[PDB]
């Protein structure tokens, strides 16, 4: 539908040939709206040399800047540590000789235009980590497990602690780190201490003992803590940097189980707890807004002990939507989706014009299943996992199969433009895919064993496609790079050409600026209610107590949203109902439509929580607003609050007070 497209692309396609790119090759973008890309290489000659290339134009042209690093061998293990935001910081870690006291880094503050070499008073063991508040503050662990901090972008270091296993930056330049006191990190597991320093090593506070590990998610600090006189451990949560802790209402686990924070934001967390006896699955729980009371969201959630692969995916392009895989009772794998932050999970709706595959019991009734990390790890023919971007609202693209379970067959690519409610087959056969200019353009490359020289693109969100031949020397295709954030109209195609005699790495960068030659205006956008189920209901669209309508680009408009495009939306607040509340600790919601009632008996970890929980959390009316829930007016449960503590501890003989 695009006219003269070949002529509009041909003078905007840019080839670069890399003279040498053997070994591990990596690419990092430096900053937003800079067009800066660094390509680094590392190979050994076994019976070490590194190459560094830099673009400042979104990959159209590179310059060999290997000379800047004195042709030194860069260790790929540490990668390029790119600083936050647009600080323009880059640190590369070098291999030193065997004589050396400490290692060596090459540091740049101007987007890798210039580097200086700095010799370290230690040998780094981890990648260097920037404070998110301050790109000049770095921390790093040494090979001797010292924790070292720098206040001047790695110019000078000081070791603030000697026996450290893990360290991370919190907010406001805070450091949390675990320490061992006995022998090694591994032999002191479960008896580590957790420390905090708010002032870069001047003061410390020990905020936990008998630690196994710790992590940060949203507003929460999580620590797993081992029960003394025991081999099991439990999660404890703090929202004040470990000044105070509460036990979370979650099962304890043995040494062969794990917890994993699937996703976390300012409101809540999704926690996975592995099932006992390494069955390769566990259960998803969602927290309230305190990170303390957890609701079982999804049983038999697939998460493998080998490598730790899970299909859990936030569909970033529609609020509330997540997708994952679960094991059926027959041990086939199905895809499930939730539209309300894990309150309910369902099968994905089959594309109207799809045929049910061989996994389907019924040839007229089946569902869509999605290939993701686990499929890829099992060596299925799946080039990419599912793609969605916050700024291209409603769009999700993924390889999938239509049936009753995930198939081993070669998959096709499906797209949804409503956040996952409905799907269509987008392309036949496996492809690599990218979204450019906030959904203004979708691009795809065929995944082949033979060389390719065509790229497909759509300006109407994957409904109609045009094919451009971007080279007359077909390449073995390796990968697509585009600027993080999906707001660019540049896409780079990477691969290599092979002859009998020789081969060579090549990139082609294509600029769509002449296809999308006009800016979108107000008339190019149309109102769209997200989550619509039934247009006859005044509450159609309500999720977590509010609806949103978006101004979405019309499919038929062919125009650029723009690098400064802002997703325009307008909320409507829904009335509160009982569905906007979670059962608080001690209560549940039996068979039907939504009244939280006292549990008759507390067993298992509920019983543990009652004995170990604070009054604050044990005093309740049985309801708590779903976190992120924005309803106003309507039902407001007025049952009076009671201490459930008295209920359980009532059975126990108490010792003297």
């Amino acid at each position: 539908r695009v006219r003269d497209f070949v002529a509009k692309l041909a003078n905007n396609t840019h080839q670069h040939v890399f003279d040498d790119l053997r070994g591990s090759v990596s690419l990092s973008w430096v900053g937003d709206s800079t067009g800066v890309i660094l390509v680094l290489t590392t190979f050994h000659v076994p019976l070490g040399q590194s190459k560094l290339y830099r673009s400042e134009d979104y990959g159209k042209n590179f310059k060999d800047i290997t000379d800047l690093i004195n042709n030194t061998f860069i260790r790929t293990e540490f990668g390029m540590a790119i600083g936050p935001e647009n600080s323009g910081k880059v640190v590369l870690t070098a291999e030193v000789s065997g004589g050396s006291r400490g290692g060596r880094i090459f540091r740049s503050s101007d987007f890798a235009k210039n580097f200086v070499q700095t010799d370290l008073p230690f040998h780094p063991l981890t990648q260097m980590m920037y404070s998110p508040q301050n790109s000049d503050y770095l921390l790093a662990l040494s090979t001797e497990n010292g924790l070292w901090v720098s206040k001047n972008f790695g110019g000078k270091w000081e070791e603030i602690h000697k026996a450290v296993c893990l360290a991370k930056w919190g907010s406001d330049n805070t450091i949390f780190f675990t320490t061992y006191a006995n022998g090694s990190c591994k032999a002191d597991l479960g008896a580590l201490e957790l420390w905090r320093t708010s002032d870069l090593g001047k003061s410390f506070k020990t905020i936990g003992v008998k630690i196994y590990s710790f992590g940060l998610g949203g507003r929460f600090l999580f620590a797993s803590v081992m029960a003394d006189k025991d081999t099991t451990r439990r999660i404890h949560v703090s929202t004040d940097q470990g000044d105070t802790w509460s036990m979370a209402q979650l099962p304890s686990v043995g040494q062969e189980q794990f917890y994993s924070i699937l996703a976390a934001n300012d409101d809540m967390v999704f926690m996975h707890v592995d099932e006992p006896g390494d069955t390769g699955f566990g259960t998803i729980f969602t927290s309230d807004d305190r990170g303390i009371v957890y609701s079982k969201s999804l049983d038999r959630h697939l998460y493998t002990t080998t490598g730790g692969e899970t299909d859990f995916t936030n569909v970033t392009s529609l609020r509330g939507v997540y997708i994952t895989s679960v094991l059926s009772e027959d041990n086939s794998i199905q895809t499930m989706i939730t539209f309300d932050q894990g309150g309910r999970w369902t099968h994905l709706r089959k594309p109207e014009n799809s045929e049910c595959d061989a996994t389907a019991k019924n040839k007229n009734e089946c569902s869509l299943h999605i290939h993701a990390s686990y499929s890829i790890s099992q060596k299925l023919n799946v080039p990419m996992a599912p793609l969605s971007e916050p700024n291209a609202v409603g769009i999700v693209i993924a390889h999938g199969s239509v049936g009753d379970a995930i198939s081993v067959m070669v998959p096709d690519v499906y797209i949804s433009d409503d956040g996952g409610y409905s799907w269509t087959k987008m392309l036949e056969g496996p492809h690599y895919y990218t979204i450019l200019d906030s959904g203004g353009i979708i691009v795809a490359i065929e995944h082949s064993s033979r060389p390719i020289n065509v790229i497909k693109f759509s300006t109407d969100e994957g409904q109609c496609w045009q094919t451009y031949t971007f080279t007359r020397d077909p390449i073995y295709f390796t990968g697509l790079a585009s600027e993080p954030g999906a707001r660019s109209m540049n896409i780079s195609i990477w691969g290599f050409t092979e002859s009998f005699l020789t081969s060579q790495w090549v990139s082609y960068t294509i600029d769509f600026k002449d296809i999308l030659e006009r800016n979108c205006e107000e008339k190019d956008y149309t109102i769209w209610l997200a989550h619509s189920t039934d247009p006859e209901d005044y509450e159609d669209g309500c999720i977590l107590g509010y609806k949103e309508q978006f101004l979405r680009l019309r499919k038929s408009s062919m125009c650029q949203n723009g690098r400064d495009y802002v997703v325009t939306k307008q909320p409507s607040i829904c009335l509160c109902s009982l569905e906007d509340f979670l059962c608080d600790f001690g209560y549940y919601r039996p068979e039907n439509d939504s009244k939280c009632v006292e549990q008759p008996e507390l067993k298992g970890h509920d019983l543990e929580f009652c004995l170990y929980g604070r009054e604050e959390h044990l005093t309740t009316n049985g309801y708590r607003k779903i976190p992120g829930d924005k309803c106003q007016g309507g039902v407001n449960p007025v049952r009076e609050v009671k201490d459930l503590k008295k209920k359980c501890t009532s059975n126990f003989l108490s010792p003297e007070k």
Partner: peptide
């Protein structure tokens, strides 16, 4: 994801 983040293991504990």
């Amino acid at each position: 994801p983040y293991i504990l």
